[PDB]
Design an enzyme around this catalytic site. Sequence first.
Site, mmCIF file in Angstrom:
data_model
loop_
_atom_site.group_PDB
_atom_site.id
_atom_site.type_symbol
_atom_site.label_atom_id
_atom_site.label_comp_id
_atom_site.label_asym_id
_atom_site.label_seq_id
_atom_site.Cartn_x
_atom_site.Cartn_y
_atom_site.Cartn_z
ATOM 1 N N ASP C 169 -22.117 27.775 76.534
ATOM 2 C CA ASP C 169 -21.428 28.688 77.534
ATOM 3 C C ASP C 169 -20.293 27.797 78.598
ATOM 4 O O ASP C 169 -20.293 28.045 79.682
ATOM 5 C CB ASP C 169 -22.628 29.318 78.367
ATOM 6 C CG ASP C 169 -22.242 30.363 79.234
ATOM 7 O OD1 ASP C 169 -21.465 31.188 78.895
ATOM 8 O OD2 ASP C 169 -22.454 30.142 80.526
ATOM 9 N N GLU C 413 -30.732 21.946 76.746
ATOM 10 C CA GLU C 413 -31.389 23.292 76.091
ATOM 11 C C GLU C 413 -31.255 23.320 74.343
ATOM 12 O O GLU C 413 -30.830 24.386 73.904
ATOM 13 C CB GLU C 413 -30.750 24.543 76.521
ATOM 14 C CG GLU C 413 -30.771 24.683 78.060
ATOM 15 C CD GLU C 413 -30.532 26.069 78.286
ATOM 16 O OE1 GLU C 413 -29.663 26.947 77.524
ATOM 17 O OE2 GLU C 413 -30.923 26.845 79.373
ATOM 18 N N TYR C 469 -34.200 31.027 85.213
ATOM 19 C CA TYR C 469 -33.478 31.895 85.729
ATOM 20 C C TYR C 469 -34.255 33.196 86.295
ATOM 21 O O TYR C 469 -34.126 34.253 86.151
ATOM 22 C CB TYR C 469 -32.483 32.256 84.788
ATOM 23 C CG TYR C 469 -31.414 31.438 84.622
ATOM 24 C CD1 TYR C 469 -30.464 31.244 85.528
ATOM 25 C CD2 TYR C 469 -31.322 30.409 83.648
ATOM 26 C CE1 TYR C 469 -29.249 30.284 85.429
ATOM 27 C CE2 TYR C 469 -30.094 29.359 83.407
ATOM 28 C CZ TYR C 469 -29.324 29.323 84.416
ATOM 29 O OH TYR C 469 -28.293 28.464 84.231
ATOM 30 N N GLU C 504 -31.079 23.551 86.382
ATOM 31 C CA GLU C 504 -30.113 24.637 86.590
ATOM 32 C C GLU C 504 -31.001 25.980 86.963
ATOM 33 O O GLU C 504 -32.228 26.072 86.580
ATOM 34 C CB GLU C 504 -29.602 24.976 85.153
ATOM 35 C CG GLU C 504 -28.591 24.135 84.676
ATOM 36 C CD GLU C 504 -27.967 24.380 83.361
ATOM 37 O OE1 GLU C 504 -27.855 25.621 82.998
ATOM 38 O OE2 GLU C 504 -27.369 23.478 82.590
HETATM 39 O O1 LIG Z 1 -26.354 31.524 81.698
HETATM 40 C C1 LIG Z 1 -25.587 30.738 82.291
HETATM 41 O O2 LIG Z 1 -25.126 31.002 82.973
HETATM 42 C C2 LIG Z 1 -25.931 29.178 81.979
HETATM 43 O O3 LIG Z 1 -27.402 29.238 81.435
HETATM 44 C C3 LIG Z 1 -27.809 27.637 80.802
HETATM 45 O O4 LIG Z 1 -28.690 27.929 80.055
HETATM 46 C C4 LIG Z 1 -26.842 27.052 80.381
HETATM 47 O O5 LIG Z 1 -27.029 25.648 80.628
HETATM 48 C C5 LIG Z 1 -25.201 27.052 81.053
HETATM 49 O O6 LIG Z 1 -24.443 26.409 80.007
HETATM 50 C C6 LIG Z 1 -25.061 28.499 81.022
HETATM 51 O O7 LIG Z 1 -23.677 28.655 81.663
#
Ligand SMILES: O=C(O)[C@H]1O[C@@H](O)[C@H](O)[C@@H](O)[C@@H]1O
Lengths: 598, 598, 598
Positions: C169, C413, C469, C504
């Site tokens: 991404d 990941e 997330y 993250e």
């Molecule tokens: O979805 C996203 O914003 C992010 O999700 C994560 O899994 C990745 O590490 C990252 O590279 C992506 O930019």
Amino acid sequence: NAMLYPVLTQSRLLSDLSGVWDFKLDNGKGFEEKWYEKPLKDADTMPVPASYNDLKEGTDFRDHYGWVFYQRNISVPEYVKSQRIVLRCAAVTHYAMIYLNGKLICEHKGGFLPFEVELNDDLQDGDNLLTIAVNNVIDYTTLPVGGKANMMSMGAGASDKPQNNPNFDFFNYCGITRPVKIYTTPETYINDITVTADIDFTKEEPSAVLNYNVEIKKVELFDEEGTKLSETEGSEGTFEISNVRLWQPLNAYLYKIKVTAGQDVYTLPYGVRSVRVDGTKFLINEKPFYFKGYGKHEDTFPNGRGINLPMNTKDISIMKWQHANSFRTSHYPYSEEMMRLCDEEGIVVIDETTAVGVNLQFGGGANFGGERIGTFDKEHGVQTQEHHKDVIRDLISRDKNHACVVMWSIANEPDSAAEGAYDYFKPLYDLARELDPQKRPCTLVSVQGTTADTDCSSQLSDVICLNRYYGWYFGGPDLEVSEIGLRKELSDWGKLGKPVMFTEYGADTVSGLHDTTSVMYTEEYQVEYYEMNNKVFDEFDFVVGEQAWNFADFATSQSLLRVQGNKKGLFTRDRKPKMVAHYFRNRWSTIPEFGYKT
Amino acid sequence: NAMLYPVLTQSRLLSDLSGVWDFKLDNGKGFEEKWYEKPLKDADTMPVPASYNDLKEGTDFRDHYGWVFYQRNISVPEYVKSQRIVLRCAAVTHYAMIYLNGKLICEHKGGFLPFEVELNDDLQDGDNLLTIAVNNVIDYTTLPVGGKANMMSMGAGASDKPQNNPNFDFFNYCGITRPVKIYTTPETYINDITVTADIDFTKEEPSAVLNYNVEIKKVELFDEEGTKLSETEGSEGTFEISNVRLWQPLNAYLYKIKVTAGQDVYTLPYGVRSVRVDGTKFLINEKPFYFKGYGKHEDTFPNGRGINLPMNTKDISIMKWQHANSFRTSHYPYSEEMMRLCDEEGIVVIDETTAVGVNLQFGGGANFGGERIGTFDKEHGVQTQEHHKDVIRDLISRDKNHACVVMWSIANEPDSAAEGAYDYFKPLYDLARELDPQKRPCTLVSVQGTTADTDCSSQLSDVICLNRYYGWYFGGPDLEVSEIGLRKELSDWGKLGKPVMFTEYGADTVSGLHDTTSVMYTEEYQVEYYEMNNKVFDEFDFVVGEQAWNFADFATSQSLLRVQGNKKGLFTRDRKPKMVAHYFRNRWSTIPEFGYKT
Amino acid sequence: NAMLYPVLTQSRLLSDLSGVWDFKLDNGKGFEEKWYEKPLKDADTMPVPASYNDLKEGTDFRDHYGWVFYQRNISVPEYVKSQRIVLRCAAVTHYAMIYLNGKLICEHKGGFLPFEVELNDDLQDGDNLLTIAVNNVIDYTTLPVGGKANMMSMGAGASDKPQNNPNFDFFNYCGITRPVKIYTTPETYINDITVTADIDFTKEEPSAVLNYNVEIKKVELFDEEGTKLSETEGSEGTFEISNVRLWQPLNAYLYKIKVTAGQDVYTLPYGVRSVRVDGTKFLINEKPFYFKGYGKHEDTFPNGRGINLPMNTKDISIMKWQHANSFRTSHYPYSEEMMRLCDEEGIVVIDETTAVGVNLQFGGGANFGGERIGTFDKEHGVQTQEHHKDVIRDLISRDKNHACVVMWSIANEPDSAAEGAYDYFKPLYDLARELDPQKRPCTLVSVQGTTADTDCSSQLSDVICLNRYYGWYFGGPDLEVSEIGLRKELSDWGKLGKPVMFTEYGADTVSGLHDTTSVMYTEEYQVEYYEMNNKVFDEFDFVVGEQAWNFADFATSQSLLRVQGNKKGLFTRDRKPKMVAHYFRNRWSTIPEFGYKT
Ligand SMILES: O=C(O)[C@H]1O[C@@H](O)[C@H](O)[C@@H](O)[C@@H]1O
Ligand SMILES: O=C(O)[C@H]1O[C@@H](O)[C@H](O)[C@@H](O)[C@@H]1O
Ligand SMILES: O=C(O)[C@H]1O[C@@H](O)[C@H](O)[C@@H](O)[C@@H]1O
């Protein structure tokens, strides 16, 4: 006097000292305690080259007054101490003081032009401590000019803290603006090169004769690919080429020039191009040119005024995408690398000095015995003319060979209709024409309020360059009444039989603000503003250039009139287009480089 | 004199004429050709109620000067001609002229207060042509005041086209601002109602006595749900309730009051509340209040100043979300529906007249024989005092009963420190206190530059209301120097032993502009500005209110100082929060309605 | 194997070749016609160092597939041909091919780690034509991994034009990403340096013993200012310092180390610091640390991934302004200059390899005989493990000495819960621990869907690093249900008795979008998201780090799910703060570097 662009060659080195140096703000005991003697304590970090103002947080850092101290250690092996060691500071804004091991080796005044010093003598062996002190103070003795209060003067002014108050509309970015490099060369070395072009349009196949001088303290020609075609001996010299490929706007060509001179050698790209004025017409290669472009700033985030070659290439790409052909170095000479890039990519440049703010009617105007002091008051006015000449000297001595450089601009918006203006600029124009070996046009950019009868530029200048804001500062938001005023003044300018071009015109526009029924600061109003102005421009066969202000949004000093800087750009500070950018792209696409309205 | 809010009852009807009417701009032969006689030709469409300025395209429509013509047919069946037919124009901005079948029935001056006329006589049967002519001209005879050039005076001014030049900082929205309704009532009818509250805090269970008068040309009480609790006969009257539920800020309660008077009847919601000044303390229900809120505008897109009940409810929701408690009707009385809503939801209101722009020092200041004319010059100054009293008359006569209305504001930023100011406002304050049956506090909002010693408000006003911009117009961007100035002036205001509140303070902020090291116009600077000001407020036990300017971004006349309107709002024009909105929400959450700093 | 950061010293030079080079896109006859032989024809211009993708206009240029050709002439004087001439390419993304005079001198695979070649042999005298060919193709054999369609797979896919499809991404920025320099050194020279630190916390005044090795093909110590304090002879070596100033987070200290070795010499800054895991606690200098920061990208406009030292310093300034202390090199090793800057400024770094996209469940997943191919399928899966080890080799060999580097991240990941995962990563973790002389922790960043029981990281890794997330991709917009899920999974992770940190977590947020009642993509929702997540983090004594995603908005491949790139940044791409940036600044201000919840 003369300074060639350092570059790796058969005989010279080039060691870029760019990197993260040590850094410390003066407090202001820096010189008392001789911080230049020892390494700096409690020092912060600072990259070079870059303006330092936006690279830390806090108003005290950004609005710092006075001196800052850069520091970095250097070391040279002895096996080239045989050569001469010279230190080229491409630009230090504003006033530089170069120490080494604690000894003041050099001083310089002038924040936008290069200067060098020789290192052989004070370069002991081992690790040698290099310290550069940078001052940012501006006043009636500097170019650009520092005032006594805010340029737009409600406001501030009640503070005793010493502060810079720019008499100009851009932020006082300071520090080591441009690269600091170290290069070598042999004792007895090429110091300066000059090349002129007498060229012949009589024939269907234009030939060109190239005179040159090589001041010193074999000459080979090469064409683009490097296919050699001629040779000559001595500082003496001449070349005879036929089937010249003329350096054109948006169609560049750079012959190469190899000058071997015993133990030393240097290569210089050169473009063969002619430019001369002829009544109304501005002729480049004996064809009627028409300027399409902008006034720019060396302004990016977070470099401030620091050199940004990625953006320079991106700006050129956007210009060629927008079908522009020219820009002006508002309001100071730009980096050498950008000038050479304009040679390669074929962009016409109006090279301008640092002479902005030579106009004491801005702000409230300084006062003395109740009386207001005129700009060129000999006791209380500007004290810049002698430094002003050194700038014209150093500038032309640096960009004398660039094919892109087409005209010189002595000053931006000086009080050119006031008492003392003519006697101030007459020696400057004379020095400009005396030292330019190509004798290219000279001008000054005229503030609003100037007329043909009152401007000292009406006489001294080969081209009339206007900064008019009919429909913004003057007339906004009634574009109809503003149109009448613009036509009235522009007609009067045709009296001179000289070429006229608008070097600045625009309207502050915050990207995102729209309305179907436009109001000021929206993208729609910006387009309508330029529509009205351009309509009047197209009516007069003697206007030969439109240059919008600005190319991109840029930072200024804080004021109620500046919405996080100057928003008159066609593009945002990160080079994203406003709606007016697509308007100009559509208009400039139908206007040719040559013979627009003849 | 007196006007009750029309509402459906047992004896009166209510026919809202709101809808799309016919519309036409005067040109300006409208009255010569008697357009009011016949239906309009070449007419456009226009909804009612709404300001018309933003509902069509083109600068000529938006900036129209003069008259406009609304038109619409009406019809009434005869079986209620037995009743009286009255036409309530809730507001027509500015000057209204009501024709019918070609006959001028009514005239009105005053763009923000209701007025009615009777229809029985000129209402022939069938379809009857109703025409309303609306004028937008403003000058030294109107409230608000119209000037001779832009209020912020570079600019415009070179145009001969007749134009309005507001001496105030909001857009001159005009047209049928508020609903035009038709209601009935029987010959011999309730014309006016008045209710005061003598209430007793001696007891642990507060009782209240309610005096009332019912002017006319049975009285029942009801509580919230409608459980009846008392009764009395005659225009004469009194109620004795014990266990009163006191109308509180952010905790409202409205008893109902049913007044049957023979063939007619009307219901009025009333809240029992006490308010009085006591040296420093501003007491509501004998408790030390502290204002939390804003100066608002009746300003939405695209209604202009037109009434917007959806937004009114949304604004209340946002206020209760932000933990506010009050606002001021800057700079004119708001709609009746918003006032009644503030009764239901329990928002404290500072009801203000239309007296903005009574200050001829704004702009360049009008000139006569070279001399500048002072504000209250009897020959060349403002001609508004008599109309000014009619506004105080009509306003108090309309909102005398609202529990939310807590204080009257005679004027916004008048030249209150100039020659003639005291003699101008003394009869106005006297009329304000004479006609308010509850004898609530009176004030005027003081322009910047005013001091305790120079302000005629220092004497006439029960509360001192300041509009100070330390850190924006005065001091920006140095918030430290601005802090010193704010503390210095605010200390001097404590000399009076009177309550002080800031009714306006703010900084223009364009939603989206940010920086870690803040500059003016960014969201960060706005927060820091309010931080500095609020810090100084918390130091003085005699400041009893903070009201930010503004609640939301709103439209103004075009000028270099206005970035598509006034951007000092905590929320955007579409009520979306800037970062400062979450700052105030966090601060106001810890500050109580009562006993903040006692 | 080993590569020291080139820098000017007593014995070595350093000639930065940065500048505007010649440039041309392969078409793809570049190698057939041997463009590397001659100078390039019809060439465009391109600055170095910089990703080329955003420096010209048009989708064909930005989305170019295949090769590009850089070209530039170089020249060296003979008086240092006595020395060895080496060419250090700091980074070429992805695959580099270095010609000179037409001869292929070097090749390299790996777009984010340095590599050098020796020039003495093929460097004829005069002007020598240097050509670098850069390839951007990504597939199952490269790190990062290239897929077969869009990573977010509606969409595209119907095109036969060969295209890169990142299995990651971020945008596939390519070209000469980092500086290309030339430095010298004497035949017999310092090739590698290694320094470890056995240090003693027993005493109230911590002492430290520094072992070192100096591979080669006098050793002096110096402290900050340069006051010398010790000396030793031989490749052999040890130092005994007492009163050590421990390199701390946000309180750095760098001793200097001068290694003279006959004709050669090199200086290395070193910080004395200890780090070890202890059940729950992550100890730095035997104190319980807590990470505060972000995952970053080397991403700026218009440099793309090109090195940007002005921004690097600005990013550090913003971090210290925000009270952060750490970040991760997502998703590739950063520039050397940024690593050294983190040493000076004292920022904790999690150095990560280029191993992103080793997960074939992203997208629709590649297919074979109808069957879907697992990630580590030996015939149709990833072909990266051997190159993966060279990356771990070159990375640790480069940043072995940095005090800021605190932990290694083997991959971002990967399909770490799939068949073949353990056998893929076991040799990688082993190589990571074998070659790091300091034996610092190792980890892998776990994709969502991973559990404690299923992750091969649960065993191989010293620290658990999660990318979760809850409240965005999973649960949004219901933050309550998302909270429950986050607490449930996080509790299960406490089973391991190992430290857990979120590397993250974030929510896409378009700067400017607001609402009092928040919805996804507004600044309010972003703050609420982080509030919920941080609330659950504070409940578990075994979570030792929060790192938000991302630090700033950055460019990605086009897709319906990416609103002009990834908008999960706390700051905009031009480093301007969103509202969440001030939230984290207020939270991180109360959380200390050490002993947060012990
Ligand atoms: O979805 C996203 O914003 C992010 O999700 C994560 O899994 C990745 O590490 C990252 O590279 C992506 O930019
Ligand atoms: O007001 C403006 O935007 C500009 O006006 C011009 O006169 C100046 O050349 C320029 O420096 C300003 O930025
Ligand atoms: O300048 C401003 O924003 C405001 O200043 C105040 O004095 C006025 O009350 C208000 O109408 C203006 O909008």
